[PDB]
Amino acid sequence: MNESQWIQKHLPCMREANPKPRELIRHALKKKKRPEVVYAMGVLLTLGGESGLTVEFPVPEGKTVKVKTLNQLVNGMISRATMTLYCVMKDPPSGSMATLMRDHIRNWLKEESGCQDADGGEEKWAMVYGMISPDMAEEKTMLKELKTMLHSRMQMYALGASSKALENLEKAIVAAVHRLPASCSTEKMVLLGYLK
């Protein structure tokens, strides 16, 4: 229940959207996320009580087939996901089937769409980097060596180091954060929340 909050809680990129159903749709389309995901959010919204999200979506290519069973839905999502999802919105199921489709799409969004993992990419490391001079990093401490690792990571990317080399360093960083003392309990699981 409450698809908007569900979407926003579980698909981080969507928190930047105005919480209304259509606004979420206009937002993800603008951001040009994979077509499957935006259509899945459409279905999840409709099945939750929104009634005309169809006009928000670009009509996809091909025959407009109808989607009654969890079966059709799951097979249509192999090579024709957008069309099948769009067809769900356009002529929605009811009762128990609606529930099965709902839990399917929700589960799909949460664990297979790739849209549930936080922002990877360079912005990530610069963000976690700007978290260590606010922290008195002058402190007789090895927490300052984290910042020097993080600095070298951002530096390495600019200076052209391979993905493999970059990845070693990322493993080391995550290693060093785990090996931080128990008085950094909260600080640990925050840092580990941004780097997985």
UniProtKB/TrEMBL annotation:
Positions of disulphide bridges:
13-115
Superkingdom of origin = Viruses
Protein name as it appears in the record: NS2
* Species, as recorded: Isavirus salaris
Tell me the name of the encoding gene: NS2
